[PDB]
Design a protein around this ligand. Structure first.
Ligand SMILES: [Hg+2]
Ligand SMILES: [Hg+2]
Lengths: 30, 30, 30, 30
């Protein structure tokens, strides 16, 4: 039910934050 | 699924939009 | 950098928001 | 200049689409 759905979203939320964080990171290193 | 699972999907798209605006802010100042 | 590089940043945040809405659409129908 | 910035953004735009695409993929397999 929502339990699995929640975990799946929490997982990609985290991935997406890593992606953003990575983006601005390289944007500086540049 | 049913409109129940939808509340969950909406809940996170909202957190997604939040991350994006913060990201925009960081770039702006950057 | 200067407001020139800003045009670029804005250009892609816009494409980012576009991907998100499409994603919302898919989930909605899903 | 904008050339590098552009490529960097095009790179994460692509990554972000893979992420979204992956998300809805697992959302179905569920
Ligand atoms: Hg999502
Ligand atoms: Hg970006």
């Amino acid at each position: 039910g929502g339990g699995e759905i929640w975990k799946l979203h929490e997982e990609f939320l985290k991935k997406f934050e890593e992606l953003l964080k990575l983006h601005e990171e390289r944007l500086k290193k540049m």
